[PDB]
Amino acid sequence: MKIVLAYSGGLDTSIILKWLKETYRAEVIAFTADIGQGEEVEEAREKALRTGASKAIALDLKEEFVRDFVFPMMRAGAVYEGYYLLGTSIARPLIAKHLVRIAEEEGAEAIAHGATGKGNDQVRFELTAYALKPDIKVIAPWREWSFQGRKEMIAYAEAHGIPVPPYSMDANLLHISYEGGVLEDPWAEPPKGMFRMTQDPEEAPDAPEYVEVEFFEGDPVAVNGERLSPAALLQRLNEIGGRHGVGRVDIVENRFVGMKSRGVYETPGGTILYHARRAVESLTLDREVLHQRDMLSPKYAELVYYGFWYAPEREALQAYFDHVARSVTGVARLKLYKGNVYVVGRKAPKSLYRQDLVSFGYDQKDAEGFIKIQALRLRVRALVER
Amino acid sequence: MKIVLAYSGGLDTSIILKWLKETYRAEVIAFTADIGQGEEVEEAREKALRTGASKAIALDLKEEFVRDFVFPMMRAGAVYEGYYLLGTSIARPLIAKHLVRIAEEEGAEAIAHGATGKGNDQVRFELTAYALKPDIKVIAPWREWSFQGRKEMIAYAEAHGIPVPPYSMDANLLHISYEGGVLEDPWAEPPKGMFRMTQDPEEAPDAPEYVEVEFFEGDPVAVNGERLSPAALLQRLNEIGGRHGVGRVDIVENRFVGMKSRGVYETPGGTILYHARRAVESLTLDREVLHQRDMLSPKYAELVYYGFWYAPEREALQAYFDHVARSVTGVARLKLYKGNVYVVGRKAPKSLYRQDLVSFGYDQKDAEGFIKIQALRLRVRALVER
Amino acid sequence: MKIVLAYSGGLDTSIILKWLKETYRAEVIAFTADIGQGEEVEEAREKALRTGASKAIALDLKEEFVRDFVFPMMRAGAVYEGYYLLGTSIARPLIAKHLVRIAEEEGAEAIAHGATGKGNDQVRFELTAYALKPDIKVIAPWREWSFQGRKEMIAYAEAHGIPVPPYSMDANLLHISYEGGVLEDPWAEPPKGMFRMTQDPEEAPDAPEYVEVEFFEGDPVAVNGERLSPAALLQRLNEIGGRHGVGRVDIVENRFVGMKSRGVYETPGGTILYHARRAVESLTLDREVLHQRDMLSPKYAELVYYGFWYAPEREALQAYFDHVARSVTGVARLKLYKGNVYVVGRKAPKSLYRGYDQKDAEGFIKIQALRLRVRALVER
Amino acid sequence: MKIVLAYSGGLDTSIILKWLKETYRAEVIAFTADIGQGEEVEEAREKALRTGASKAIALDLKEEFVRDFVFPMMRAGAVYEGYYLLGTSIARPLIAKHLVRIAEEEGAEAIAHGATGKGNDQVRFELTAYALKPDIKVIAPWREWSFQGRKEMIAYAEAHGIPVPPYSMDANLLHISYEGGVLEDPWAEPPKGMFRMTQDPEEAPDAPEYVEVEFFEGDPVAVNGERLSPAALLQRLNEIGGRHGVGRVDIVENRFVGMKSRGVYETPGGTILYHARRAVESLTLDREVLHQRDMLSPKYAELVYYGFWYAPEREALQAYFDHVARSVTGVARLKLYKGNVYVVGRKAPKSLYRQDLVSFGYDQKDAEGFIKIQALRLRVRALVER
Numbered sequence A, B, D: 001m002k003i004v005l006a007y008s009g010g011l012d013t014s015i016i017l018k019w020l021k022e023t024y025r026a027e028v029i030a031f032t033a034d035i036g037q038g039e040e041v042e043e044a045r046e047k048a049l050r051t052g053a054s055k056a057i058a059l060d061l062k063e064e065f066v067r068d069f070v071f072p073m074m075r076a077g078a079v080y081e082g083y084y085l086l087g088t089s090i091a092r093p094l095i096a097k098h099l100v101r102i103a104e105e106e107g108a109e110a111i112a113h114g115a116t117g118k119g120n121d122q123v124r125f126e127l128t129a130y131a132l133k134p135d136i137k138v139i140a141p142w143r144e145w146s147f148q149g150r151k152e153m154i155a156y157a158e159a160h161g162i163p164v165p166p167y168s169m170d171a172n173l174l175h176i177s178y179e180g181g182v183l184e185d186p187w188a189e190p191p192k193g194m195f196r197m198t199q200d201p202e203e204a205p206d207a208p209e210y211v212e213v214e215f216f217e218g219d220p221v222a223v224n225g226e227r228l229s230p231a232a233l234l235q236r237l238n239e240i241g242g243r244h245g246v247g248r249v250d251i252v253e254n255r256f257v258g259m260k261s262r263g264v265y266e267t268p269g270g271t272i273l274y275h276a277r278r279a280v281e282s283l284t285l286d287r288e289v290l291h292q293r294d295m296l297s298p299k300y301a302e303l304v305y306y307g308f309w310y311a312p313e314r315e316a317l318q319a320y321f322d323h324v325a326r327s328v329t330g331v332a333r334l335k336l337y338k339g340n341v342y343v344v345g346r347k348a349p350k351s352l353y354r355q356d357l358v359s360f361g362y363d364q365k366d367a368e369g370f371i372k373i374q375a376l377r378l379r380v381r382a383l384v385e386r
Numbered sequence C: 001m002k003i004v005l006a007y008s009g010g011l012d013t014s015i016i017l018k019w020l021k022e023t024y025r026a027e028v029i030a031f032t033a034d035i036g037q038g039e040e041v042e043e044a045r046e047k048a049l050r051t052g053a054s055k056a057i058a059l060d061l062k063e064e065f066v067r068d069f070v071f072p073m074m075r076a077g078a079v080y081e082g083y084y085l086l087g088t089s090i091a092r093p094l095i096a097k098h099l100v101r102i103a104e105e106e107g108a109e110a111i112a113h114g115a116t117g118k119g120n121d122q123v124r125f126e127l128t129a130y131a132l133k134p135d136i137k138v139i140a141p142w143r144e145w146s147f148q149g150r151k152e153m154i155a156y157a158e159a160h161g162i163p164v165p166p167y168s169m170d171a172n173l174l175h176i177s178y179e180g181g182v183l184e185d186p187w188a189e190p191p192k193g194m195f196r197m198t199q200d201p202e203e204a205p206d207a208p209e210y211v212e213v214e215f216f217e218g219d220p221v222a223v224n225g226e227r228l229s230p231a232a233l234l235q236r237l238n239e240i241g242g243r244h245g246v247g248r249v250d251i252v253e254n255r256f257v258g259m260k261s262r263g264v265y266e267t268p269g270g271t272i273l274y275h276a277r278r279a280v281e282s283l284t285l286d287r288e289v290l291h292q293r294d295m296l297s298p299k300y301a302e303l304v305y306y307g308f309w310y311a312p313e314r315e316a317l318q319a320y321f322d323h324v325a326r327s328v329t330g331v332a333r334l335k336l337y338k339g340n341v342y343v344v345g346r347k348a349p350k351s352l353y354r355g356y357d358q359k360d361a362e363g364f365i366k367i368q369a370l371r372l373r374v375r376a377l378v379e380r
């Protein structure tokens, strides 16, 4: 039986690559995707044919990632439990998508990933796979093998002949994530030097830096006047924001599978994009529309976090968020300074702001009528209390 | 006829005190509330008598303000349109509450305030006024008089001999807000040296400062180990946070009255409390409870912003928020550095976090069944789409 | 000066037509819409000319009504305060839309309506008017004149030769509504014989009647196998449902302008459609999509009731509802009997009705239980 | 080893009792609850002993069922997917609560139930058990045994001296439900004569019957002037409403385990109470409160349906609903006629209704200002759209 493996190029997926050959004695098609992890994905591809893959595939998926996943999510203003911008959550559906596609092209019966049985990724990968190909066979080695510890895994590796080697990490164009190890103690500050994508606030420039982001119908299309494709734009903003230490979050989140987990996230580009978007929305979105959208964002966020991307509830909400987002067109101007992102200006060709309505269609005495009617039910209530 | 005027002590409220006497020929009882504006109310009170008041009352309400208004609102995690912590919003109900109390004591048929017809404050004062005493009469000189300009107003002061003197501002224990004037241009960054409560970040200490906040049953009770009363506690956090330039936001908000307005706000202590509270909630609140609470927070916020404090909807939601907040007991550790507030640690007597659930509560197969069940409907969906 | 008046042809708008000519010394263009009130609109158009209108317009708007207002609203499962199917609510935006359009074509600076200052219709008419044409001028005589009672109004009409003929009523293709007068005491049952569109349940047929309604992509397209246009379909279900006394509701509602009001509504066709729609949705909609939808429906309902039809919020929610409703394709089979509507069958081309093993269930449960056990252990 | 078995008395639980003894080499303590299923619980209690239980407990939990489970739920206006009044759903938590209680008193380490692995009841039984006693062991035979059919199960029963006997049913004081078998075809109308608790409308009296229900503080306390205890009251309304064939529903619902299923429910008393409650709320509840409440009701309904009764989300929402419900005091008058329940009147001591404001607290002029303010943002949008 052929099996398509989400191959990362590291120890575990290498061990998994042989484990699959050994255990199932199946033909293994490896798949590595470049989503901005900062790894020469082609090496991964080499190491896979080298580990025994009957075929290895690598694809530059950066643009599709930002265009078809990050952007639609940002359009919805998705924030999980107040701070998490879903860096890892949104990338998983993209990977599983290709896994299933490849499996259908290779006539492969199953797909495999090395997400552990303790996290959210296994759900994201599998819900995606089952949603796209209900008959797909899934193999999650971490839930099926006997290994107990890394000593045993290192051992097993040293065996078969797989090169071997404080916290776990997941990185992509949207963010870099840290959790586990020394991070597992909620009262322990993260260790100095851990952050990779963002410069340390204290080592951030002494002079603030201004940046402008242009949005067109809900999506960012240019930075400082330079049009940039989805991936190139997130990249650019990561560079600009990174140098200033922007986008660091430290939270104890609730995992879908039931337990709390301490995670640390750095999302420089995305964090600038989040505040810039709300800046443009502040002029282009109607009051009542904004208030409704915001009360739905959290639900959409958990859908993403839990793994329900290619799910009807999420696609339905997407219709609402996309409708609203289509009006978000304009430019936000932000000030970057030692870890902070400050909105200092915004403009829109179709801005709903009118200074003439605030400076000292509006008539003061109308306010009295407004107030009286609004107060009626309250006045009746009081009178009944007598 | 008697009129209880919410007298702040400045030009406008002085012009209004005179106006009320000439227009209604009634006794004008002035009431000035100390809520942290940084004015010596007792001075406004004597000036009120000088200006013509038949009786001037001054009351220290910082404790009532933080305890009975700011705290209940904070338990709800109230945040208007993404960034506004509602500093001015929760103060108005307190003031109105007293105007009506005094009127009832003085045998006054009416109360008066100097909020304009273009803003939200008029609604806040009046909805609480009518909600508390349905038969009360409200006079809002700004909606009734003829002054067409500032100059016309300065002249009227002189005619009656009242002391006379780029943006408007409101300051209390919770924050200091700025809007209007040069701020009316949303593309124009606020002027240097505008902020008053928070030191400017570029001028804040070079070394981060750590602060710890203890929450008992939903409310903050101590700072760095020192137990403090509500007002004293907010004060302490303003000092600490201000020194670091924390809690600065710049937004274009939607007023209840219909138009957008560019607002700038500095909420040092409140911003530290916002994040400290969530840090403690991250260990003490159940996942689902949290997700539901966050989708309701925005609604409660709009209620406070619009002026529906003493309204049955707000009081109802308050019952839910208080029920949830009751479990928020623990300590948050945050790092303050040049305008930013970072959560670096948190602990709680009844933390729901367990490292044993993440260290490498169920076994591997459990996750598989959970996944199969969760995917069932997605697979049926896909099969039907055949 | 020209004023486009929403003229229904009765005493009030006739008086209003006279009042406007003299008070504003303007030319009045009358507009009467046929939305299924069961009245000859042409008669109204003629009476308007006799009353003094410089021009009178009458349009058959039943198809536009059901297709562009009733259908989109139904796709949303809109129900105000648990019972009100919003019969009068969704109709007002339609009328005002035409008032503003006619004003545009006739070069009229203002429009007028005879909705009183204590109801919801004035808000509905004006919010839509202002929304579609921001600088339009609106005149609501009930808010501007000073008639001190009916007596004085009858007198005024008699003076102008306007013919002067226990509760207030409103009727259109969607429903017939009753409120005020003898109905103002919420403890009192409506009087017998008050109902018009529906047969009294005690007088309904002794045999039940089965009906089948087909929905295509969120909209009902046929009844008992016969394809029918929007308006014709609502009419057919009103006949079928009405004969059986279906769709009667008695509620005390909260008006947008602040007070409670006791209302009685008969919506035979819309009531059948409401249950028929959910019946088809029960096979075609996903569980989570359905649950989210139902939690948003009430907000939409209040938007319609309040008069925010041509408002961005309602338009945004409509995008969600329409997206969801597009899957509603199938047939609902209902049984009608003396006042009641019983779903009795349903089917669909893409039904989601009918894999794992009992074992998977244990895992699902263990994982779902985890946070609950932790909470318990902590409580010690 | 001791095992507390939720013993109903039928073939399945008798088989399970014997199965448990030999499979787990343990003694079984049988528990039969009287929740208005219309059976003699003492006979089941005695049959359990004959089947081999070491001890058999039988309790009349009717009053607790209505007072502590049904009323709280109704207070929330809980309705699942438009029509299900949750008759079976709210009874399960009550059963499991006692199983865990009895296990602790008897020193039993585990509990057992005969709910199948493909239904919702397993989730309801187990989630409440684990929530109340985290270390309890749960044994669900349907998910563990090797019986391969009904034929084998009958032979096993007959071999163990257990007496052996178109759709499946569940009956209790709140309703009677039917599903499976012939009912599995969603296009087929239920068979004639299926209903039990309610008379067919065709056979219901030609004379309508008026019934009045008094609500005190969110709960029904009297019927036609006669004070009745919770269980006695539900019983009375089932009798009155049942004669008129009120409360029948036919739906295809979404199960928590992932699939859809056709269910038929008859809830005479509950249906009368549902409309009676709303009738009383129409006079006693504030507009904004009601609207917020109805938007949360569905969520609470799914919690109950899924089995999250003794769960923090549910108890938090219960705080909101109970707050709101406290104001629900008055009497509702309904007319029952051939399958229907018609509200014809309502009155309340603290009714918020005043015909003082409808017949011909403000004047039409206030209405004008109200409209203008409300329309401002819509007008701005139109001008901007040009």
Ligand SMILES: Nc1ncnc2c1ncn2[C@@H]1O[C@H](COP(=O)(O)OP(=O)(O)NP(=O)(O)O)[C@@H](O)[C@H]1O
Binding pocket: A005, A006, A007, A008, A012, A013, A031, A032, A033, A034, A035, A037, A095, A112, A113, A114, A115, A116, A121, A167, A168, A169, A170
């Ligand atoms: N770039 C990729 N291409 C293909 N599959 C991937 C890729 N990245 C991750 N995966 C899949 O995800 C599983 C977990 O990946 P991994 O990079 O180990 O994340 P992690 O568990 O969050 N952190 P770490 O502790 O560093 O392993 C792997 O076993 C892969 O199957």
Ligand SMILES: Nc1ncnc2c1ncn2[C@@H]1O[C@H](COP(=O)(O)OP(=O)(O)NP(=O)(O)O)[C@@H](O)[C@H]1O
Binding pocket: B005, B006, B007, B008, B012, B013, B031, B032, B033, B034, B035, B037, B095, B112, B113, B114, B115, B116, B121, B167, B168, B169, B170
């Ligand atoms: N400390 C106070 N004690 C009593 N009444 C107050 C107090 N502060 C504000 N008010 C009331 O609020 C109205 C508006 O107050 P004001 O201080 O002018 O706020 P502002 O409109 O936000 N900004 P500005 O006037 O431009 O400084 C006043 O007329 C008072 O009636």
Ligand SMILES: Nc1ncnc2c1ncn2[C@@H]1O[C@H](COP(=O)(O)OP(=O)(O)NP(=O)(O)O)[C@@H](O)[C@H]1O
Binding pocket: C005, C006, C007, C008, C012, C013, C031, C032, C033, C034, C035, C037, C095, C112, C113, C114, C115, C116, C121, C167, C168, C169, C170
């Ligand atoms: N069919 C129609 N065509 C044009 N305008 C209409 C039409 N129906 C109603 N209107 C407008 O709506 C206002 C109120 O109409 P109306 O028929 O009096 O309803 P009502 O106030 O609910 N009940 P009633 O007690 O019968 O007056 C009228 O003054 C008209 O301006």
Ligand SMILES: Nc1ncnc2c1ncn2[C@@H]1O[C@H](COP(=O)(O)OP(=O)(O)NP(=O)(O)O)[C@@H](O)[C@H]1O
Binding pocket: D005, D006, D007, D008, D012, D013, D031, D032, D033, D034, D035, D037, D095, D112, D113, D114, D115, D116, D121, D167, D168, D169, D170
């Ligand atoms: N009154 C009760 N006392 C104790 N346990 C009960 C009681 N009622 C139900 N149970 C438990 O619930 C499981 C399922 O009960 P049951 O009455 O068979 O419901 P059902 O599955 O919906 N329908 P059916 O078996 O077709 O009549 C049983 O195996 C029992 O363990």
Ligand SMILES: NC(=[NH2+])NCCC[C@H](N)C(=O)O
Binding pocket: A086, A087, A088, A089, A120, A121, A167, A168, A169, A170, A171, A177, A178, A179, A180, A263
């Ligand atoms: N160190 C890591 N690899 N972290 C990955 C974090 C994933 C994040 N907790 C999520 O649920 O999406």
Ligand SMILES: NC(=[NH2+])NCCC[C@H](N)C(=O)O
Binding pocket: B086, B087, B088, B089, B120, B121, B167, B168, B169, B170, B177, B178, B179, B180, B263
């Ligand atoms: N410049 C000022 N005085 N601003 C007061 C800001 C009040 C703030 N916009 C609010 O709605 O509460």
Ligand SMILES: NC(=[NH2+])NCCC[C@H](N)C(=O)O
Binding pocket: C086, C087, C088, C089, C120, C121, C167, C168, C169, C170, C177, C178, C179, C180, C263
């Ligand atoms: N008797 C009448 N004319 N009733 C009109 C009812 C209108 C209904 N109350 C609404 O708000 O839409």
Ligand SMILES: NC(=[NH2+])NCCC[C@H](N)C(=O)O
Binding pocket: D086, D087, D088, D089, D120, D167, D168, D169, D170, D177, D178, D179, D180, D263
């Ligand atoms: N025929 C039966 N035994 N039905 C029990 C129905 C239970 C119902 N489906 C529920 O989810 O609560």
Ligand SMILES: N[C@@H](CC(=O)O)C(=O)O
Binding pocket: A114, A115, A116, A117, A118, A119, A120, A121, A122
């Ligand atoms: N990637 C980690 C964490 C997660 O999936 O949430 C794991 O495999 O467990």
Ligand SMILES: N[C@@H](CC(=O)O)C(=O)O
Binding pocket: B114, B115, B116, B117, B118, B119, B120, B121, B122
């Ligand atoms: N206090 C300001 C602003 C506001 O009330 O929103 C005014 O009186 O207009």
Ligand SMILES: N[C@@H](CC(=O)O)C(=O)O
Binding pocket: C114, C115, C116, C117, C118, C119, C120, C121, C122
């Ligand atoms: N149509 C009625 C009722 C309403 O508008 O709600 C009126 O004009 O008053």
Ligand SMILES: N[C@@H](CC(=O)O)C(=O)O
Binding pocket: D114, D115, D116, D117, D118, D119, D120, D121, D122
């Ligand atoms: N009681 C049935 C159905 C259900 O629980 O939903 C079963 O045991 O499967």
Ligand SMILES: [Mg+2]
Binding pocket: A012, A114, A115, A116
């Ligand atoms: Mg890993």
Ligand SMILES: [Mg+2]
Binding pocket: B012, B114, B115, B116
């Ligand atoms: Mg002012």
Ligand SMILES: [Mg+2]
Binding pocket: C012, C114, C115, C116
């Ligand atoms: Mg009328």
Ligand SMILES: [Mg+2]
Binding pocket: D012, D114, D115, D116
């Ligand atoms: Mg059974």
